[PDB]
Structure 1
């Protein structure tokens, strides 16, 4: 547990990030959440963190595709929390197309959010962590940080970048009480994946649940989705003392994707 700890999760209004936020609050951390969505939904999430788990929670809206906005977000988060012990760099987007058709503006958007925001958020968080001699940076990469699939040039590039950046962060901070690791999930049935399921379903002329099975069968040997709650549990483990010497590495929760 994490009582007393101060955590920030990017892209935590929904999906994996919301589950990360929830598991951290359940472990006793105060939490800054972030991301887009309907204002009434975001506020109900923020207030639920506080009323279920007895922590402080803050929502800071920032579009993390802008470098300065990300750096300012971290400073505001730290001010809200009174410190910053755990940063989860989670916000991300996807777009599928073959390379020769891949929109330039989608390349730029995915690099900006999925890769550069991790750099700017880390850069802003590190001096706070270095001053207190304790920190956790948890980057949400992907199985696509280690291997590739067709039609995902920007995302694969970005996620491979995140894995590299994680290593660098870990080595620069080696021995300082700060670790940096990349969680690399396989398929998790959030809206980011439901769109891909829907696309397969129209391509193949099949019901959505058949399409979900086809999506799994191609990549994920277990034939089951990874859950956001599992991922939250992994982030809680990374934040624990057992993981004090776990740094610069990848934690794959991928149902076997990368074993073959």
Structure 2
């Protein structure tokens, strides 16, 4: 369990990030949620987690394009919650086009959120974790941090960058009670994906998965949350600077 610990999860107002925050809450950690969305819907989620799990849950809507807003998210977590034990760098965006057709605005944006936000968040958290003599940094990368797909140049470059950044973090913290690892999911069934799915649908789901994901099954936010729980546990104290692939066999082949 993680009673007495505080976890910040970026981009946790929905999807994977919310699944992770929810799993960490269920182990007793206080939580900082982050992301965009409807004010009322977010408050429902925040109040609901706090009441269901008996922990404190803050919401900080910091826009993570801006490195100063990222470092301020972390510093505010420490101000409001007392400490920061676990940082999950999860927020991300996508844009598909050929390299030649790839808008520079999208390239820049993808790197800023998907990579540089990891740097800024991690830079802000480390001094606290080192003083504590305890930390877990869990970066949510992708199968695309290890291998590539056509038409995803910026996202693949950024995720790969996250993997290498994760390894450096780990080497700079080795033996100080801090680990840093990257979870690399394959396909997770988010509403964005759900659109693409629409001769019936569970024949369409299987067909969409079959190119990359041999199990023909989606990964779930709940499974990624249990993977983050595991990495946050004492059993994972010597797991550092590595990747945990949660991808249905995508990287096996």
Give the TM-score, by structure 2 length.
0.97
Quote the offset at 1:92 in angstroms.
Answer: 0.4
Quote the offset at 1:209 in angstroms.
Answer: 4.3
Quote the offset at 1:194 in angstroms.
Answer: 3.2
Aligned equivalents of 2:207 and 2:150: distance in 1?
Answer: 16
State yes or no: 1:68 paired with 2:68. Answer: yes
**Corresponding residue for residue 211 of structure 2:** 218
For residues 173-226 of structure 1, the C-alpha deviation after alignment (integer angstroms, 9 at most, x for no partner) is: 00000000000000001134335x25xx5xxxx665444222200000000000
**Corresponding residue for residue 234 of structure 1:** 227
In the TM superposition, 1:78-227 aligns within 5 A as: 78-195=78-195, 197=196, 208-227=201-220
Structure 2: gaps spanning 5 or more residues: none
Aligned equivalents of 1:54 and 1:182: distance in 2?
Answer: 28
Q: Which moved more, 1:186-195 or 1:206-215?
A: 206-215
Aligned equivalents of 1:90 and 1:135: distance in 2?
Answer: 17
Aligned equivalents of 1:74 and 1:209: distance in 2?
Answer: 41
For residues 64-115 of structure 1, the C-alpha deviation after alignment (integer angstroms, 9 at most, x for no partner) is: 0101111111111111111000000000011111111111111111100000
Give the TM-score, by structure 1 length.
0.95
**Corresponding residue for residue 244 of structure 1:** 237
Structure 1: gaps spanning 5 or more residues: none
**Corresponding residue for residue 51 of structure 1:** 51
CA contact (8 A) 1:94 1:192 kept: no
Aligned equivalents of 2:182 and 2:20: distance in 1?
Answer: 14
**Corresponding residue for residue 250 of structure 2:** 257
Aligned equivalents of 2:136 and 2:216: distance in 1?
Answer: 31
How many residues matched?
253
For the residue of structure 2 that corresponds to 1:219, the secondary structure is: coil
Query: RMSD of the TM alignment (CA)?
Result: 1.2
For the residue of structure 2 that corresponds to 1:105, the secondary structure is: helix
